[PDB]
Design a protein around this nucleic acid. Structure first.
Lengths: 784, 868, 12
DNA sequence: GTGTAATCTACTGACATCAGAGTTCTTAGA
């Protein structure tokens, strides 16, 4: 502990002393090696507890650095350094385990035991500063464990950063020692990283600024040999990496390093299609060229005497911006021409051919730069297409902040010159054409990762949304455009964090939409109130995973909006439950990697709960909103929706079936009968019998397309076989309802009447596919 | 010169000097005419920003400056003000969930023990030693991230429209200062505005005077600049276009400046407007048209050139023919034409204008450049400079035409004449003598870094190599960020050089780590990497391809020299990489270069067999391609007289060593025969008797034993087809060319059937009976893969089916038996039409499948076709 | 064919 | 520690000076 309180020469002698006491202790053998373990472990506790976070830990770097590497100690060792380093890493494992890191009350939470939470961070930054630099031969035995135990902790508690950081040290340190290239427990480590990599890719989308930085820092670092297994799962990760990097250098260096790695190892034909979308977003780093009297200077002035040597000898960190520029050019070169041509927008066919037209036929934004002797006119619109590009993607931050402040001024001018209407409609509203292409700029430039820009534009985007539902010109195509922009902001594929701001934007839009307009028009005059929901709903059923993802993420952010006052209009959502619960799980039997969607189905769960929590008035008579999936219109009562659920209680898509079953369970007691679930199922079996059950659990959902039919599946194949395999899975899990709450009796579960589900489970899978599963046929990594 | 000084303080002081009232005039127009005088060559890269700053800061004292830009707010909302924090921090950086008093000071004692005091300052000093260490570590980040806002940012629940005029003209200036393309737009707009509002103030007498003053000043600008910063050159021209009477800008000056600045198009429009406007009385105006020709040649659009010279406007038809040749990249013929042109003794109808000679010379130099005759390049580049035979290279820096037109080729020539093999020491002398004078030095250091780098590296002075190449990387960044975004072709011609720079960087960094010197693994590493990184094939001009080839050649020579106490591996790379260059040149229709490289690399054929077969393959490929272009009678010589002979497998059992060759060589021989037969059939009336002896003597041997007159062609085709068949049976051994070879046999059949339908050949049709069978059973076989080119021609199928009916059965039973139905959806329409007539047995199963799979496609065409 | 040139005087 | 003194110790030009070495002459002398 005393270490930092010394002088440099004192530091080196103190290191020597502590090193040798360690030697001496170790010499006496096992009786005290345990005690040496104790001593280091205690040490690390007391350093990681340094009372504040950024005598800070940064001071102690040298101590453990020399301790861990000074092979010169014994000659002026190899077993010494090995043992000591091993002890350090064991200490880190132990201390990461023993800490609690409990999270509960993304920023709406508060970490449980504060002082504990700070120590974690300290330890993270330490172990960063100490571990990889050794290039340890010694880390090889510890890759596996220091991973597995760390992954466990990560998964069990994501949304804590430094786990990813330590894991990044793990992976890089492994990479440097040619570990994974072999594809023992090494195959296990490659496997575990494969799975965590995919998992963390899925998770990365949702996360926000700092955690996003951590996760990318990790992901972008996995070795090549793991990449080519699942490429294009990471390409978006790297893109978002560079987008951050233009305003946080070390992450950018992490990128450029990563991209060099990929380009040099991954088989070219594998990656050729992908440089298209990845090399752009290099433009910013080269976007601009950004157009002393220290003691040694004065010393050398008087003469080249001995004193100069003292200063220069004493004279003799994270990468800087200029260095990363020269790196970016060096890499941009290193890929080669046949590759690098892609840095320009596209091959010259159509897309850039769009870039030429002016953003507006006729030049609005007429400014009158107010000189004295005269009043010339300067058209601010010609500035704008380049100013905006600066604003989003400039590298030099002085340029970027200046550009941002210009664009704020300039958009304010747009609004102003709008209200000085020179043209009241009778065609395209003036400055609409300008709005269409300035709003996406304004949006995705908000929730950028420069704190200054963020504070400058997030409020303005809120103010713009506010203005564009003010009563005056609430109807105008300008608001139509802005809403269209927000929606295409939700659906944004790559800009992960843009999603969240766009969501908040939609929320604010709906909020002011209710709060501002007279509802007399609002029922049917606008293109907003029901229109917005309709637009979402239309988005839901879409094939694209990202598009639905956006649909969800929006509808997630209108919990409160819909529950507040829309009590008049529970009804769109009393059917939306169907809409979302269905679509937002369809087409998720595939498209899993990019689809963090299923977590947003939890939003379906919340909207669910909030609609049933008003049930006494939910089931009012003569309320007959047309639903989807029900031909005969009638006054919807929850009975109908429940029957729908039970019909949909079984369906092949996994997440839906799980959520839907449990949702049925949570609904049924709310119904007027107040009958217990088991009681009500008994009711409908006395009413309909086992055939109802068999049709609804061996089948069900969207009608009766095809349920669990044993024999033809036994007899009748390619990866389609997986289809029915999932069917049987869904089957037995649906039977798991039966003593899920003891709702159905055993002879009621088994009347042996007309179902062979359990028969086929115990027979077909459990014989032919259970263990004979090396190669299946009924008569590629795809399978594996 | 001080107006750009490094210290910000002196920057402000000198600028405030130059903006005081009595130095530059106080009204606008007198300012705008003055700032032209505020320029020097060296102030260039900033001159735009500086002009903008001066103009606007005189705007700064006008009465509307604090008067808010828009009179009323847009609501009643209350407006607050908030400051933005900006404390040298970004957003992804903090981890998530964490006076008679003064007289009193005389009451002091003093430590008496100088030892104790000494220790006190000692510890104190180590404290500042650590404090300085950390402050030096943090000041880098602080220099990066220091941001100063510029306005108030009042907050309100609505937008705060009511911003003071300052709140926009000051930020605009800030951006203009910091980035130069916005500078160009701002200065251009503001200059346009001032010179447009000048009307309401001065009579035409004054306007002529001020316009002439600007024209003089701008001509000075362009003619005197050396940096050639793309933004400023562009700004000056762009100003000139949007106002009349500035338009008579020295055409030669603009032409040269735009050629250099890699920003051509703006210059094209300048001279364009010049032409149309100043001549709505000298009819020709050659000095302008010709320099426009130079421009369009730069931008590589040889197509438009064909217009300029066929107008009976001044230029002589020798130039026309030269251009037609050089459009087809027949650069050799172009050079011959030009050389004969410049040396015409006496002309009919007047000697070429001063400028036509200029264009001729520049085209000559460039036309050589596209070639590998670099000794000729140097001779051309040096001849015109001086009088005596041993050229006084120093003269080049005398008067500007040389400085811009002759230099770059001079230096590029001498560089490679050095870096290839060996040569004298002219260039070292030249550049060293040059690098004394100031403007002298600036030209070389700012433009031609990538070349001085290699020059110096030849002398084994690695340190200067590093300095120059670093300068080159910075220069690329600066002269690239400058190029305006829309000019794609310009930016492309930029990037084509980052490969050169990076390659030089890598070699320097490779001869810097002796740990990577003494071993052998990382030489293999570098060789493997360079082996599979190449410039773009079909796009990048060969003037860069040679740059990479020769650079790499020299660098390998140097590395070999280091690792003398292998050469197999280096030779291997040299083979492969030069071969790739030939293949490239073959694509670009740059044939003569391909001739020369084949001839330069044959002597390496004698070595082990894979390179032997590769060389012969490439040469025959090139011969075929050369034939395709031109030659109708003599073209048979261009292939038969050699290519047949060379391709004989007597020299190669490599087919027994691998199969890829066993495909490639056979398809080569196929196409060899194919053109022979095609042209022999072309105008048979005058071939065998015109290629009267040796080729004809070879012909029958190539044909059949019987020397019959007409039947010789069929004798060719018969073995042709059997050979292509050999190609396909090669293919069936495991898309690389198999799709292509399949299509190739397809095409041979197709042309043959077309020819057959125009006559009656019983025996050729009898042996043809296979041809349609194969075309269906095999082309459609190929349709399985994407085969876009094949999938297009599918109507040819149905027609083949019809006209040749007996063998339809193959179609159904073979491939429509297996088509992926979408690959017919493309034009499902035609055959759903044909779905009535007797062959309908054909599409039956296909239309059924597509009906089932993608029903909504068939319905709309099918519903109508149902009516028929 | 050999490549030949001669000097030229720029009339300005 | 950092920085400014004060001041000893150096080197050189220059000048005396012992010694050391190159040189001619008498006696004792094959």
């Amino acid at each position: 502990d005393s270490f930092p309180q010394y002088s440099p020469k004192m530091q080196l002698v103190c290191c020597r002393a502590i090193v040798k006491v360690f030697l001496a202790l170790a010499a006496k053998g096992p009786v005290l090696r345990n005690c040496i373990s104790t001593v280091v472990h205690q040490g690390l506790i007391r350093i990681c507890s340094k009372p504040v976070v950024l005598p800070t830990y940064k001071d102690y770097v040298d101590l453990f650095r020399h301790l861990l590497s000074s092979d010169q100690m014994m000659d002026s060792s190899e077993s010494l350094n090995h043992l000591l380093y091993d002890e350090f890493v064991k200490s880190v494992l132990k201390i990461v385990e023993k800490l609690d890191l409990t999270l509960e009350i993304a920023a709406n939470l508060h970490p449980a035991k504060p002082k504990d939470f700070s120590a974690f961070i300290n330890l993270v930054e330490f172990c960063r500063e100490i571990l990889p630099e050794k290039q340890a031969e010694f880390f090889e035995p510890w890759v596996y464990s220091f991973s597995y135990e760390l992954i466990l902790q990560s998964t069990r508690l994501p949304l804590i950063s430094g786990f990813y950081k330590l894991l990044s040290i793990t992976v890089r340190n492994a990479k440097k020692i040619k570990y994974f290239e072999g594809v023992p427990e090494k195959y296990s480590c490659f496997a575990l990283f494969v799975k965590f990599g995919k998992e963390v890719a899925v998770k990365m989308k949702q996360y926000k600024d700092e955690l996003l930085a951590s996760c990318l820092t990790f992901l972008l670092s996995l070795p090549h040999n793991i990449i080519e297994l699942d490429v294009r799962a990471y390409v978006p990760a790297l893109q978002m990496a560079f987008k951050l990097g233009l305003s946080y250098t070390p992450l950018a260096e992490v990128g450029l390093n990563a991209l060099e790695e990929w380009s040099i190892y991954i088989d070219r034909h594998v990656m050729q299609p992908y440089y298209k979308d990845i090399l752009p977003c290099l433009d910013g780093y080269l976007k601009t060229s950004a157009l002393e009297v220290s003691a040694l200077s004065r010393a050398a002035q008087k003469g080249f005497n001995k004193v100069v040597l003292k200063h220069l000898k004493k004279t003799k960190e994270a990468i800087s911006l200029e260095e990363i520029r020269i790196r970016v050019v060096q890499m941009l070169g290193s890929l080669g021409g046949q590759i690098n041509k892609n840095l320009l927008t596209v091959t010259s066919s159509d897309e850039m051919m769009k870039s030429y037209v002016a953003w507006d036929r006729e030049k609005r934004l007429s400014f009158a730069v107010p000189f004295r002797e005269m009043k010339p006119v300067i058209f601010l619109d010609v500035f704008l297409p380049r100013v905006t590009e600066l604003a989003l993607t400039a590298s030099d931050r002085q340029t970027k902040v200046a550009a941002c402040e210009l664009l704020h001024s300039m958009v304010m001018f747009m609004l102003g010159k709008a209200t000085q209407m020179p043209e009241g409609g009778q065609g395209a509203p003036p400055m609409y054409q300008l709005y269409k292409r300035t709003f996406p700029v304004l949006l995705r430039l908000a929730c950028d990762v420069d704190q200054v820009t963020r504070q400058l534009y997030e409020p303005l985007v809120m103010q713009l949304i506010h203005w564009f539902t003010n009563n005056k010109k609430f109807e105008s195509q300008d608001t139509v455009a802005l809403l269209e922009a927000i929606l295409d902001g939700i659906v944004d594929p790559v800009d992960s964090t843009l999603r969240d701001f766009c969501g908040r934007c939609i929320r604010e839009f709906l909020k002011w939409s209710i709060k501002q307009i007279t509802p007399q028009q609002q029922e049917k005059s606008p293109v907003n109130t029901k229109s917005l929901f309709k637009r979402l709903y239309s988005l839901a059923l879409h094939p694209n995973a990202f598009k639905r993802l956006g649909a969800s993420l929006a509808f997630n952010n209108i919990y409160r909006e819909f529950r507040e006052e829309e009590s008049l209009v529970e009804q769109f959502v009393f059917e939306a439950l169907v809409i979302y619960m269905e679509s937002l799980a369809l087409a998720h039997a595939d498209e899993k990697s990019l689809g963090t969607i299923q977590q947003c189905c939890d939003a379906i769960d919340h909207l669910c709960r909030i609609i049933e929590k008003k049930h006494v008035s939910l089931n009012k008579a003569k309320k007959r909103r047309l639903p989807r999936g029900f031909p005969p219109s009638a006054s919807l009562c929850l009975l109908d929706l429940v029957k729908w659920l039970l019909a949909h209680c079984g369906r092949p898509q996994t997440e839906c079936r799980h959520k839907s079953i449990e949702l049925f369970y949570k609904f049924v007691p709310l119904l007027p009968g107040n009958r217990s679930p088991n009681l009500w199922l008994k009711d409908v079996l006395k009413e309909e019998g086992v055939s109802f059950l068999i049709n609804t659990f061996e089948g069900g959902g969207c009608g009766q397309p095809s349920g669990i039919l044993a024999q033809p599946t036994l007899l009748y194949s390619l990866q389609a076989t997986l289809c029915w395999l999932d069917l049987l899975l869904a089957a037995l899990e649906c039977y798991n309802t039966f003593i899920g709450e003891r709702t159905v009796g055993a002879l009621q579960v088994l009347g042996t009447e007309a179902q062979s589900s359990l028969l086929k489970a115990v027979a077909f899978f459990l014989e032919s596919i259970a263990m004979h599963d090396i190669i299946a046929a009924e008569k590629s990594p795809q399978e594996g | 010169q001080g107006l750009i000084d490094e210290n910000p303080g002196l920057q402000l002081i000198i600028r405030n000097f130059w903006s005081h009232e009595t130095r530059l005039p106080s009204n606008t127009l007198d300012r705008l005419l003055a700032l032209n005088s505020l320029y020097s060559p060296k102030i260039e890269v900033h001159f735009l920003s500086l002009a903008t700053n001066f103009l606007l800061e005189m705007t700064s004292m006008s009465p509307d400056y604090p008067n808010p830009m828009f009179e009323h707010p847009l609501s009643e909302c209350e407006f607050q003000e908030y400051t933005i924090d900006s404390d040298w921090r970004f957003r992804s950086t903090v981890l998530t969930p964490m006076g008679r008093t003064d007289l009193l000071r005389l009451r002091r004692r003093f430590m008496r023990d100088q030892e104790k005091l000494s220790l006190m300052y000692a510890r104190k000093g180590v404290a500042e030693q650590k404090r300085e260490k950390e402050i030096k570590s943090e000041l880098k980040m602080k220099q990066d991230a220091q941001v100063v806002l510029y306005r108030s940012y009042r907050h309100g629940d609505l937008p705060d429209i009511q911003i003071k005029h300052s709140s926009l003209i000051t930020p605009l200036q800030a951006v203009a200062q910091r980035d130069p393309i916005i500078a160009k737009q701002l200065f251009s707009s503001l200059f346009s505005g001032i010179l447009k509002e000048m009307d309401k103030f001065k009579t035409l007498s004054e306007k002529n005077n001020i316009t002439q003053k600007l024209l003089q000043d701008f001509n000075r600008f362009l003619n005197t600049t050396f940096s050639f910063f793309p933004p400023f050159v562009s700004c000056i021209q762009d100003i000139s276009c949007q106002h009349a009477a500035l338009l008579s800008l020295d055409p030669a000056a603009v032409s040269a400046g735009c050629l250099a600045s890699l920003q051509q198009p703006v210059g094209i429009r300048l001279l364009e407007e010049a032409l149309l406007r100043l001549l709505p009385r000298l009819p020709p105006d050659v000095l302008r048209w010709v320099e426009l020709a130079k421009l369009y040649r730069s931008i590589g659009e040889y197509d438009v050139l064909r217009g300029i010279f066929t107008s009976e406007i001044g230029t002589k038809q020798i130039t026309q023919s030269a251009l037609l040749a050089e459009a087809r990249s027949d650069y050799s013929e172009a050079a011959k034409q030009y050389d004969e042109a410049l040396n015409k003794q006496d002309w009919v109808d007047g000697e070429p204008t001063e400028a036509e000679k200029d264009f001729w010379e520049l085209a000559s130099l460039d036309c050589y450049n596209h070639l590998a005759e670099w000794k000729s390049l140097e001779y051309c580049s040096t001849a015109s400079i001086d009088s005596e035979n041993p050229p006084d290279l120093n003269k080049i820096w005398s008067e500007p035409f040389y400085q811009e037109t002759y230099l770059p080729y001079m230096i590029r020539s001498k560089l490679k004449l050095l870096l290839q093999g060996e040569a004298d020491q002219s260039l070292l002398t030249f550049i060293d003598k040059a690098m004394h004078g100031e403007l002298q030095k600036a030209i070389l250091e700012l433009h031609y870094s990538q070349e001085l780098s290699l020059l110096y590296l030849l002398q084994d002075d690695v340190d200067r190599a590093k300095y120059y190449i670093q300068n080159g990387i910075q220069s690329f960044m600066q002269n690239y960020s400058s190029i305006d975004v829309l000019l794609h072709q310009s930016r492309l011609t930029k990037l084509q050089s980052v490969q050169a720079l990076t390659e030089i960087q890598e070699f320097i960094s490779f001869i810097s780590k002796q740990g990577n010197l003494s071993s052998q693994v990382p030489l293999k590493r570098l060789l493997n990497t360079w082996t599979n990184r190449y410039p773009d094939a079909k796009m990048d001009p060969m003037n860069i391809w040679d740059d990479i080839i020769t650079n790499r050649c020299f660098f390998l020579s140097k590395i070999e020299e280091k690792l003398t106490p292998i050469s197999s591996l280096i030779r291997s790379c040299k083979f492969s990489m030069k071969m790739k260059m030939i293949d490239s040149a073959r694509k670009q229709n740059n044939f003569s270069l391909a001739m020369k490289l084949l001839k330069e690399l044959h002597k390496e054929s004698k070595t082990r067999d894979d390179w032997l077969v590769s060389w012969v393959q490439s040469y025959c490929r090139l011969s075929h391609c050369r034939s395709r272009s031109q030659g109708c009678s003599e073209q048979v010589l261009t292939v038969l007289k050699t290519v047949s002979l060379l391709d004989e497998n007597n020299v190669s059992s490599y087919l027994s060593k691998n199969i890829l060759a066993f495909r490639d060589q056979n398809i080569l021989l196929g196409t060899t025969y194919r053109i022979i037969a095609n042209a022999l059939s072309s105008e048979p009336a005058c071939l065998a008797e015109i290629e009267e002896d040796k080729a004809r003597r070879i012909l029958e041997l190539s044909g059949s034993s019987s020397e019959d007159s007409e039947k010789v062609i069929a004798g060719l085709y018969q073995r042709a087809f059997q050979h292509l068949s050999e190609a396909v049976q090669a293919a069936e051994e495991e898309a690389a060319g198999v799709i292509d070879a399949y299509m190739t046999l397809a095409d041979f059949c197709d042309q043959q059937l077309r020819k057959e339908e125009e006559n009656a050949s019983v025996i050729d049709s009898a042996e043809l009976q296979a041809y349609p069978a194969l075309v269906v059973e095999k082309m459609l076989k190929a349709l399985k893969l994407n085969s876009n080119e094949a999938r297009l021609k599918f109507p040819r199928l149905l027609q083949i089916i019809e006209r040749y009916p007996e063998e339809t059965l193959s179609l159904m039973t073979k491939e429509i038996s297996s088509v992926p139905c979408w690959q017919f959806i493309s034009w499902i329409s035609h055959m759903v039409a044909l779905l009535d007539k007797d062959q309908a047995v054909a599409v039956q199963h296909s239309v059924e499948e597509i009906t089932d799979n993608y029903p909504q496609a068939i319905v709309y065409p099918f519903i109508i076709s149902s009516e028929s | 064919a050999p490549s030949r040139k001669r000097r030229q005087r720029m009339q300005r």
